[PDB]
Amino acid sequence: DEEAVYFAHLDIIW
Amino acid sequence: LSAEDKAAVERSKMIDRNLREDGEKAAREVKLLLLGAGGKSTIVKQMKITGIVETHFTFKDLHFKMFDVGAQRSERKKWIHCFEGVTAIIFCVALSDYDLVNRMHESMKLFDSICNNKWFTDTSIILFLNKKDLFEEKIKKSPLTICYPEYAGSNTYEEAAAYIQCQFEDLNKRKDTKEIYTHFTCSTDTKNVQFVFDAVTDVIIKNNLKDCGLF
Amino acid sequence: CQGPIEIKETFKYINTVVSCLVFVLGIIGNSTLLRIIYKNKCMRNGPNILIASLALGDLLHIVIDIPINVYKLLAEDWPFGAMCKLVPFIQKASVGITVLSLCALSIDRYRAVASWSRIKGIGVPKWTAVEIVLIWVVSVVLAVPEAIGFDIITMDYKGSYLRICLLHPVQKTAFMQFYKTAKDWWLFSFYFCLPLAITAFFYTLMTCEMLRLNDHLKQRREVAKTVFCLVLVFALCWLPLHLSRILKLTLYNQNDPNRCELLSFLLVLDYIGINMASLNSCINPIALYLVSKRFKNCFKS
Amino acid sequence: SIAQARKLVEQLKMEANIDRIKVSKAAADLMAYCEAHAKEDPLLTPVPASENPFRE
Amino acid sequence: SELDQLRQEAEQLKNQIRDARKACADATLSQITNNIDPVGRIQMRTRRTLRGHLAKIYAMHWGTDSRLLVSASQDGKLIIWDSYTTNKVHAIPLRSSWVMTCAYAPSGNYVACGGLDNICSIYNLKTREGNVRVSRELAGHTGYLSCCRFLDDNQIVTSSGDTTCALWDIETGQQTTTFTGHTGDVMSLSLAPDTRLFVSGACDASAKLWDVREGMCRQTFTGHESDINAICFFPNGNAFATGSDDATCRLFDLRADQELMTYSHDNIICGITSVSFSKSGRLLLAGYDDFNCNVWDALKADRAGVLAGHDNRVSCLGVTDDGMAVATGSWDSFLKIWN
Amino acid sequence: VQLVESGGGLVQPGGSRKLSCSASGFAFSSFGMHWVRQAPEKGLEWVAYISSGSGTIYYADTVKGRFTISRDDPKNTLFLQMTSLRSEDTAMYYCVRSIYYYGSSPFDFWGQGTTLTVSASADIVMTQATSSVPVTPGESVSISCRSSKSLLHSNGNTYLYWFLQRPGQSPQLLIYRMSNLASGVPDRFSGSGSGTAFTLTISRLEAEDVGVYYCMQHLEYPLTFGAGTKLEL
């Protein structure tokens, strides 16, 4: 559920 | 503040607008320069129209402006910079001059003079070979080796024209920027003007692509 | 999940090196391209200023996008500031003017061949002057959803303090909520679908017009070849970045116990996607080097 | 042939028959002219903006 | 003694002139003006800029009032510029697009304009109809006309491509007196302030004095080694400066009949287009081909200043009668005012 | 060079009338036009002005908005349409061509004019010293005029013009910008002044020199007129 924000932690800024 | 200067600057805008319209109109028309020795009168009378001679005509909704400067008979160096912005140069030579006196050697010197010219380094050259009928009759009797000691080939127009084509453009120490558009002068019309028309649009297209960064 | 997401070190050091190579290439390529255009007044006509803005755009998207992309990879955190509301915006606005001005270049190039006549001009055309201002104003006004759509929210991840900036999962504005749902579609149907629909189409019209005589056909063939590669390179460069945002909205589910394993491929696909996307801004100076022999003297000088 | 050469010789002899003045005198005259009109030369001596018609 | 005697009469009596000049050269100009205080660095700013023209500007001339100037370009338009307020006084559409010279009459009623065509037409600026139209056509030349400068309201003097110069009368439009001395192609012509003598230069690296009244070279100078196209008189009329294509400016006096100074720099290898003195003659301005215009001292010969405000070549520049400002034109269709 | 005007006559008050002026012998397109009126008992009065390129159009305060002025360069005709004119509009109307540049001669030519009869601030006033003065041939006569505002412009040019109007003839331009003389004007006429008070001097007056002197203004744009000085032989 809320774990999807972990992907945005290491994702590029775009 | 101004009292009559307001009308003075108003005249300037009216004057400036006229040159802008005139300058835009001049930009729409294209300019060509005629170079040759002796041979060019028939060329200008095919392209239907003291000092220099300026001819104006329109073909296929394109304004063609031509310059005849071969009658100057003065020093070419001190006024060749005026034609720096010319789109193309129409170089007309007489093939029959090989049997007259050495004449073609002067044409090559003239061709080498403006092919390597600094002001002409970005201007294409259109080569015209006149006296097509005269060459056909007299090429079988006289040898082309008279003015071409190194040349050794069949006595035939096909070989004779090719060697002339080989020699002329070889004189273009800039095979990349320039573009030589050789042609054979024909007595009948509707074909010589077609070649000139097709020649200029190639230069503009290449010039347009050069500005756009393609060439 | 039994495969918690963690970028491999072997795929991190290699990504840092390749990003640096594009960084140094873009700085040298863009500075040289802008310098020659400004220094020489002759290279200030219609199509020249169109390339200059795109080159200025290529000057961007490399000093604001890639410097923090590699920095985020090595740091694995966001302590730079709270700012992060702009990196996204000017960075996507920089994508707006590099994608769209490529279409604008096709507009000027089409008139260069279709009109071997109206093309004559004493100086900078009025349409180009209108376009160069319109082309900029469109992207900045189209990147405003990403302006105030980013904030700082701190989650808890097994007793750790970490600040992650992203789009708001819930947005007060109704339009912004639609933007979040249609993030991938808008990011792909405009930056990818549109250029492939006009730049490719208008370049296709060149062949039917320019092509459809020894030095005529041969010289013209290379022009078509060197102009189709420009749209092929652009499509290939931006493909990995755009492709790894559609997988998040097509096959990414919330129930299968393999999200971490699947997202590891997605995460690394975004890492080299921006590297390829940044290389796209690096292609025009390279393209202007392999072709356009006029620039040979400018680059040498 | 003959006219092109005889006329040149006559013109050269007429030019040579003219008088000459020492270079020192000419240099002194030029220096005196430059110094006398030095105060009236806006190029050498800058003109104040109030008295300059071309001042912006 | 046939043709051989003429060469002997030419080789000899030529050594007499150089022997006389060598014996007369008691001291050089640089060896006496050493006590003169240096001018120092000269800085000029573009006070006014003119952008009406759309083609390369070839020649310009200043009016008597020091306010109106004539600018010529290959586009076929003559522009009378109001340098004070930057507007255009008049626009004259020329029949021949190519133009290499333009002159403004001292009275101001007439102007001159000519180029590759052997005719430099004269236009009336004070017609009753209010328009500018041709008045006379001087079509007696053979080569391209390079410079025709106004002598008075009824007399003009022209220089053409051939080795001839002509003086015309406006009322009749005929060559009243002709000159045939140069052996090359005359490029630039200058007039003495007294309006009785004039000097011109040609491609044969020689400048020859001529009198409008009599009609014969009074003196010649062969101090150069390349084509010369820039020559102007001193304000006092007893000397003149000549610019050539070898980046050398030489000052020739009318008393010693020999060169008296050679302005040159190692860093300059380009040619010179036009040369013009200041009001007092202390400052000499030369137009060079390296996209730059230089300022030299007539006495000390130092780089007083550099005017590099033109992108292309400075084909012409002029100085007003009062020396208030300097107007220069180049191939960028732009004119700049330096003072 | 002729300016033939037509369209005048007797018009009932409150009506509409168009006056057409045809210009020949000169470039009408490059010349700005001015319409002026002169009352039968009073002096001349400015009405309207149109630029050479029809860019700037100006009107007098008394006839602002009421009148219309247009030019046709291909037809080379100046049309002045007047509507709802009152009893004070009856006058003789003149057309003047003027060109504006450095060294120009504005108001150099004056039209024949047409009579027009009808059935029954922020401006500077030229305080003329007198309305008439007797003169004799062979003598020098000096007339004086005054302006409520100094005409010395910032560019150093004073904008005052002198006009000679012979009886039964169109007015002629004598001196423009207070410092130079128009073409065809004898050199005897001269002007002087310090920018507020102006003096026009005529030396060795002849029979043809008789007429009415009119002073104009160009520092601002009300285009006012003086009372006029009548010369008696």
Author numbering:
A (entry chain L): 8 to 21
B (entry chain A): 5 to 42, 45 to 55, 182 to 233, 241 to 354
C (entry chain R): 90 to 171, 173 to 302, 311 to 399
D (entry chain G): 8 to 63
E (entry chain B): 2 to 340
F (entry chain H): 2 to 121, 135 to 247
Please give sentences taken from the publication describing this entry.
ETBR-selective agonist Succinyl-[Glu9, Ala11,15]-ET-1(8-21), also named IRL1620, is also in clinical trials for adjuvant cancer therapy to enhance the delivery of anti-tumor drugs by improving blood flow. The cryo-EM structure of the engineered Gi-coupled ETBR bound to the selective peptide IRL1620 was solved at a resolution of 3.0 Å. Different from ETs, the N-terminal region is absent in agonist IRL1620, which shows over 120,000-fold ETBR selectivity (Ki = 16 pM) over ETAR (Ki = 1900 nM). Substituting the K9 of ET-1 with the glutamic acid (E9) in IRL1620 increases the electronegativity, which may facilitate the electrostatic interaction with the positively charged extracellular part of ETBR. In addition, the Nα-succinylation of IRL1620 and its analogs increased the binding affinity for ETBR, but not ETAR, thus producing ETBR preference. The negative charge of succinylation is more compatible with the positively charged extracellular region of ETBR relative to its cognate receptor, probably contributing to the increased ETBR binding affinity and ETBR selectivity. Intriguingly, ET-3 and IRL1620 show an identical C-terminus with ET-1, while s6b and s6c bear a similar hydrophobic replacement from isoleucine to valine at position 19 relative to ET-1.
